[PDB]
């Protein structure tokens, strides 16, 4: 009531931040940005909770105000800045680059990438419109407006943009057989090949996806993010390759790893 809220209770925060309940009452309310509040990762969470480079939010503030953190090639001093899917985090002082990719359990993994792969990112386009004297435009999941896109790029396709120039380098059409990632829901974090799309006019479309090991799942069309042409990815996948293991195989692998390593 009476205008926007500026706080976020720690228990009302997104569960994929893996925050604990005894640390405090509040969670870092992510600032407005290119990614939604519930499907982002605030810079403080990444720098403190994941990378353990800082112990408190003050140390995260010191790191960020030393202009050491670059998100998508731009220095970001906001510690609650919302970093999201496919966003590139480059820390030049320590010489490592990360790409925010969901792990198979629906959480943002600490996925280290080579500096060559840190120069671009994949963006799913959200709408294409024509404005201002017949100039086509393109809106991505990253809230980037790219003017003069290729006429073959339509909605639900993912483009590849160079971060330095912010211009489209390549694109993948949304079609069966193309590799994709699920960015929302129960199957969030899973990687597979698109097999079939069911269209429901006036409602949400359903896309069916099959893993490398043949597991088949489905999700709404808005949750589909095509990664590469065919079954090969255009980006580097996390330690797990998008395969979701059942709890039985997870336990079996954990027990085998415990046995082998002492």
């Amino acid at each position: 009531a009476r205008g926007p809220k500026k706080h976020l209770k720690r228990v009302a925060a997104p569960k994929h931040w893996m925050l604990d309940k005894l640390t405090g009452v509040f969670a870092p309310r992510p600032s407005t940005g290119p990614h939604k509040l519930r499907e982002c990762l605030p810079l403080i969470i990444f720098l403190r909770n994941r990378l353990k480079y800082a112990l408190t939010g003050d140390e995260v503030k010191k790191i960020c105000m030393q202009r050491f953190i670059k998100i998508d090639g731009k220095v970001r001093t906001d510690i609650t800045y919302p970093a999201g899917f496919m966003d590139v985090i480059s820390i030049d002082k320590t010489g490592e680059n990360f790409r925010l990719i969901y792990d198979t359990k629906g959480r943002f993994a600490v996925h280290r990438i080579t500096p060559e792969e840190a120069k671009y990112k994949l963006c799913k386009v959200r709408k294409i419109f024509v404005g201002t004297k017949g100039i086509p435009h393109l809106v991505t999941h990253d809230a980037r407006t790219i003017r003069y896109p290729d006429p073959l790029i339509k909605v639900n396709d993912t483009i590849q943009i160079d971060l330095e120039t912010g211009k489209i380098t390549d694109f993948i059409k949304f079609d069966t057989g193309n590799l994709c990632m699920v960015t929302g829901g129960a199957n969030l974090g899973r990687i597979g090949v698109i097999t079939n799309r069911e269209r429901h006019p006036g409602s949400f479309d359903v896309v069916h996806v099959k893993d490398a090991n043949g597991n088949s799942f489905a999700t709404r069309l808005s949750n589909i993010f095509v990664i590469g042409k065919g079954n090969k990815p255009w980006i580097s996948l996390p330690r797990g390759k998008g395969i979701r293991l059942t709890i039985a195989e997870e336990r079996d692998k954990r027990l085998a790893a415990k046995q082998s390593s002492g």
Partner: peptide
């Protein structure tokens, strides 16, 4: 920048429309 982007898009549009015309001609050939 506006002028260069307009020129580059004009060239790309010419290529795209020419290939669309060629595809339509090939389709009507059959």
């Amino acid at each position: 920048k506006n002028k260069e982007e307009a020129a580059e898009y004009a060239k790309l549009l010419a290529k795209r429309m020419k290939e669309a015309r060629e595809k339509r001609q090939e389709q009507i050939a059959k």
